[PDB]
Every structure is written in C-alpha cells, then in structure tokens.
Amino acid sequence: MNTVPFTSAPIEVTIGIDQYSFNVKENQPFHGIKDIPIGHVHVIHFQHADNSSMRYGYWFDCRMGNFYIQYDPKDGLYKMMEERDGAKFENIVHNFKERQMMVSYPKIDEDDTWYNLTEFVQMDKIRKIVRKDENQFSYVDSSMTTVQENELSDPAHSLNYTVINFKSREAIRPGHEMEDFLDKSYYLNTVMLQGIFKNSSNYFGELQFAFLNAMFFGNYGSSLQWHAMIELICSSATVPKHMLDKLDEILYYQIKTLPEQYSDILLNERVWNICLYSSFQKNSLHNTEKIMENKYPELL
Amino acid sequence: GAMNSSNYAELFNNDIKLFVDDTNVYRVTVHKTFEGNVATKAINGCIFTLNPKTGHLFLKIIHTSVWAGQKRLSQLAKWKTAEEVSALVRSLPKEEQPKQIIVTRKAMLDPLEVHMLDFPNIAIRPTELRLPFSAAMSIDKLSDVVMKATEPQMVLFNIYDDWLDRISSYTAFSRLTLLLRALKTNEESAKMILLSDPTITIKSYHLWPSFTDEQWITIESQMRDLILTEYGRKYNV
Numbered sequence: 001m002n003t004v005p006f007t008s009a010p011i012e013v014t015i016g017i018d019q020y021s022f023n024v025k026e027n028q029p030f031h032g033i034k035d036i037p038i039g040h041v042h043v044i045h046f047q048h049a050d051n052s053s054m055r056y057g058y059w060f061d062c063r064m065g066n067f068y069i070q071y072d073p074k075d076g077l078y079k080m081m082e083e084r085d086g087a088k089f090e091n092i093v094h095n096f097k098e099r100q101m102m103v104s105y106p107k108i109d110e111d112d113t114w115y116n117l118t119e120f121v122q123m124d125k126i127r128k129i130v131r132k133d134e135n136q137f138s139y140v141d142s143s144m145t146t147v148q149e150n151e152l153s154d155p156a157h158s159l160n161y162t163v164i165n166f167k168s169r170e171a172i173r174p175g176h177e178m179e180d181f182l183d184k185s186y187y188l189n190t191v192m193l194q195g196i197f198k199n200s201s202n203y204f205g206e207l208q209f210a211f212l213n214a215m216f217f218g219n220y221g222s223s224l225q226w227h228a229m230i231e232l233i234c235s236s237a238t239v240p241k242h243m244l245d246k247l248d249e250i251l252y253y254q255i256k257t258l259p260e261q262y263s264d265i266l267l268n269e270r271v272w273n274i275c276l277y278s279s280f281q282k283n284s285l286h287n288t289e290k291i292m293e294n295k296y297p298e299l300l
Numbered sequence: 301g302a303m304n305s306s307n308y309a310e311l312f313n314n315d316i317k318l319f320v321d322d323t324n325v326y327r328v329t330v331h332k333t334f335e336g337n338v339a340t341k342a343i344n345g346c347i348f349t350l351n352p353k354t355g356h357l358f359l360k361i362i363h364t365s366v367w368a369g370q371k372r373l374s375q376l377a378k379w380k381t382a383e384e385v386s387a388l389v390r391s392l393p394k395e396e397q398p399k400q401i402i403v404t405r406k407a408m409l410d411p412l413e414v415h416m417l418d419f420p421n422i423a424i425r426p427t428e429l430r431l432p433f434s435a436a437m438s439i440d441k442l443s444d445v446v447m448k449a450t451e452p453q454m455v456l457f458n459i460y461d462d463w464l465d466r467i468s469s470y471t472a473f474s475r476l477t478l479l480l481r482a483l484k485t486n487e488e489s490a491k492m493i494l495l496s497d498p499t500i501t502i503k504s505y506h507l508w509p510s511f512t513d514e515q516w517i518t519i520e521s522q523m524r525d526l527i528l529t530e531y532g533r534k535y536n537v
C-alpha cells in the first residue's frame with residue numbers, strides 16, 4: 001500500500017482520489033493520502049473552493065516512482081512531483097503517518113469499482129495520450145482539447161486520443177462506400193484493432209481513460225472520444241463475442257459510477273439510443289441496457 | 301449551409317453548381333399477388349442532376365436491372381444516386397466540376413458526402429426550398445427516354461431549350477419551377493395549358509413549346525391560376 005504525501009494544504013480545495021473525494025480547509029493540517037492500492041493506475045484531482053473553474057489532476061502509478069504534492073503559489077495549483085531520494089522521502093512520510101496527518105484510501109473490501117473502471121488502462125498508454133515525457137505522471141484538466149478538436153491550438157497541452165471519423169477516407173474503402181458507412185466492421189477490426197490499437201485491450205484502455213477524463217474533469221473532448229469508441233463498436237455488424245461481452249461490463253460500471261446529476265451533459269442521447277435500440281449490437285449489451293433503463297430512462 | 305429564399309440569387313452566379321434530385325430513382329407500381337398479398341414491381345428511374353445557371357441536365361437513367369437481387373432498395377437508391385453523381389463529377393474536366401452540389405432531399409447528404417470524400421473542396425448542401433423536380437417525369441420527352449431504356453444510360457438535355465438567348469438564368473429557372481410546380485399539382489390541366497392548340501409546337505431538339513415572349517406571359521399566367529386554384533380546390537378557399 002503506497003502513499004501520495006503533501007508538503008501542506010495552503011488553499012481550501014476539494015481533493016479527489018479515484019472515485020472518492022474530501023474537503024480540505026485553507027491551511028488545514030493535511031499531509032496526504034495513504035493505503036493506496038498497488039496494481040492500478042490512480043488519479044488525484046482538485047477543485048479549488050474559490051474557483052470551481054478548472055478541475056485538474058494527475059494520473060499516476062505508485063509502482064513507477066515516489067510522488068508527492070506541493071502547492072505552487074505562483075502557478076496557483078497543487079502540483080505533482082517525483083522524488084528520486086528514496087530514503088529522504090520515506091523518512092518525511094513515516095514521520096507524517098506517525099502524526100496521523102493522512103487520509104486513508106477508503107476502499108471497501110467487497111468493492112471492485114475502481115478495478116472495473118480501469119481494467120485496461122495502463123500508465124504507458126496514458127503517457128502517449130498525454131505527452132509530457134519528463135514526468136512519470138500525467139496532468140489533465142477540464143479545458144484541454146484533443147488532437148481531433150485542434151483539426152476543426154497549443155499542441156503541447158493536447159489529449160492525443162486516436163482520431164475516429166466516420167466520414168473519412170480511413171473509415172471508408174473506395175468502392176465500399178455504402179457498405180463501410182452502414183457496417184463499420186472494416187474500420188473497427190482492420191483499421192483500428194488490427195492496424196492502430198493492435199488488440200482490444202488497448203482499445204478498451206483508451207475508451208476507459210476517455211470516460212474517466214470526461215467524468216472527473218468535465219473534459220468535453222474526452223466525452224466525445226468515449227462516445228465515438230462506443231459507437232464504432234455498436235455500428236459494426238461483426239465484433240468478436242468476447243469484445244461485446246467485455247464492452248457490456250465496461251459500460252455498465254461507467255454508467256453505474258456516473259453522478260446522477262451529470263447525466264445530462266455527460267451522455268449523448270443519440271449515441272446511446274442508436275447503440276441500445278437501433279444498432280447491430282442493440283441486443284448485445286444486456287447489463288448496460290438494463291442499468292441505463294432503470295437509472296436514466298429519460299435520456300431514452 | 302442550407303439553401304433558401306434568402307440566398308436564392310446564388311444559384312445564378314458564376315460558381316458552377318448542380319442540383320441533385322433523387323425522387324425518381326427508385327420507382328415502383330404496387331400490385332396484388334395471386335395469393336392476395338401485395339408486391340412491388342420496379343420501373344425505370346432517373347437521377348435529375350441540373351445546372352440551374354446553364355440549364356444543362358445530366359439525366360442518368362436507372363434501369364430496373366440495378367435492383368435485381370438487392371435488399372432495402374429505398375436505402376440503396378440514395379447510395380446508387382451518390383455513386384452516379386460522384387462518377388459524373390469524376391468524368392468532368394476539372395474546370396467543369398461543380399464547387400457545390402445541392403441535394404433536394406436531406407437524406408442524400410450523407411451518401412453523397414461519403415461518395416465525394418475525394419473532393420473535399422466540393423460543398424454538399426441541403427435546401428429549404430420545396431423544389432418541384434419530382435415532376436420531371438411529367439415532361440414527355442424525358443419520360444419517354446427513361447421508359448424506353450433497356451440498359452443504364454446517361455442522356456444530356458438543356459431543360460431551358462433556347463430561353464437563355466432571350467431571358468436571364470434567374471428568369472428561366474423561375475419559369476421552369478413554375479411549369480414543374482403546375483405539372484406536379486395537376487398534371488392534366490398543366491399539360492392541357494401547354495399544348496392544346498396547333499401553331500405553337502415543340503422543336504425536335506426541345507422539350508417545351510416554341511412560345512413567343514407574349515405567349516409565355518399568357519402561359520405563365522395560366523400556370524399561376526392553376527396552382528392557386530388547386531390550392532383552393534385542396535383547402536376549399
């Protein structure tokens with residue numbers, strides 16, 4: 001069990017750690033988060049009390065280094081930092097655990113929610129979507145735009161998700177126009193799975209990461225990307241049976257975890273009604289269709 | 301974006317554009333089967349692709365053989381239309397290719413857009429106008445060539461005859477749409493108006509009668525009357 005310690009909490013902020021969150025008061029004696037489960041990526045995120053504008057945060061994996069947070073009063077945010085000195089950082093942390101100044105990652109033993117939301121998400125792929133190669137962890141916020149968004153403006157601060165476009169030469173074989181537009185299996189299986197992602201785990205990882213950025217940061221381009229990757233599967237007549245079964249589980253847990261009061265902005269009516277009721281896979285997402293119908297029957 | 305009454309003069313500027321109407325591509329007669337069920341029998345159709353500035357009509361005849369063994373024909377018809385429009389553009393010299401294609405039905409937008417991906421600089425546009433191009437098969441010579449075709453065929457017409465020698469494009473298009481609106485609202489009477497007499501004939505190389513300027517004013521007046529009436533006869537007013 002690993003620890004994301006803090007230098008101090010100089011400004012009042014709501015701190016999120018994965019799907020949990022807690023309020024810290026200005027200058028409250030707070031020195032971090034302990035008992036973080038090893039084996040999963042994590043995200044630690046922030047919303048200042050003064051400026052609910054800009055949710056921001058950091059994706060990280062404690063196996064990859066020792067990470068600590070210090071508030072920067074010039075740039076005005078809580079920054080993640082890595083410490084090479086394994087011995088100095090530990091002595092500072094034990095000291096703090098002794099004084100009980102850390103909150104405990106509050107995982108219920110029965111609960112597999114985080115695993116289920118991050119099953120295929122790996123840090124190495126996060127770091128290729130979020131390009132900042134000098135750090136082991138990745139910053140994301142509400143305002144960052146995607147590569148595809150910048151084609152329709154700072155390339156350094158973009159989310160380099162895989163571009164999906166249903167009316168594009170990549171998506172449509174010359175002479176198969178109607179066939180490929182109405183049945184996207186070619187584009188799913190050959191172009192994206194075999195060609196770009198290599199396997200369905202990497203596809204699902206990007207899909208899960210897009211959802212999490214949409215949910216935790218209100219990142220609109222991430223939300224677009226999540227829906228596009230869902231729609232590409234649902235609009236394919238030919239999908240491996242194991243991918244459909246896993247997609248149903250993935251979406252079920254995303255829909256289960258979504259805040260009930262964010263469903264209006266985070267869910268695209270057209271995509272979901274097409275996917276659950278009109279598409280090739282309308283009958284293949286039993287768990288997802290059942291939770292959607294009992295929790296968000298208005299959208300549909 | 302979409303084409304409407306506010307930007308109507310844009311049709312007659314010097315950017316090449318084509319209207320594409322697909323309403324006559326997939327045409328059927330509905331009949332009873334011996335078992336008392338209902339069946340369709342397709343008849344020959346056509347794509348109506350029209351330059352509104354020059355009057356040039358590219359009439360692609362759709363022979364019923366193209367439907368053989370195919371499913372969901374109304375959906376295929378839109379994609380067949382887009383394939384043939386795309387083939388037509390590619391056959392034109394670059395300096396003849398359109399800069400915009402306006403589809404009369406919004407369901408043509410995605411099929412044409414996908415077929416024209418090679419042409420990113422050709423704008424595909426809908427329209428809010430209710431253009432009467434479905435009535436093109438009420439033009440006798442157009443109907444005749446469609447129904448006689450035994451194979452896929454493209455036939456080229458000028459739907460304005462020689463009108464541009466005496467009137468502007470805007471005026472010729474207004475005349476065309478008035479003629480077609482009349483034919484669409486009451487074909488018999490529209491056709492009675494146009495050729496019930498002897499001395500105002502159709503040249504072998506024309507579609508419409510050889511009317512003098514004054515005779516066109518009477519004709520146009522009679523078509524307006526028909527259209528207003530049918531609109532009463534329909535709503536009782």
Ligand SMILES: N#C/C(=C\c1ccsc1)C(N)=O
Pocket residue numbers: 005006007068069083088089090092093
């Ligand atoms: N180690 C360390 C450092 C700061 C800490 C470490 C955990 S909380 C605050 C540092 N090198 O500045």
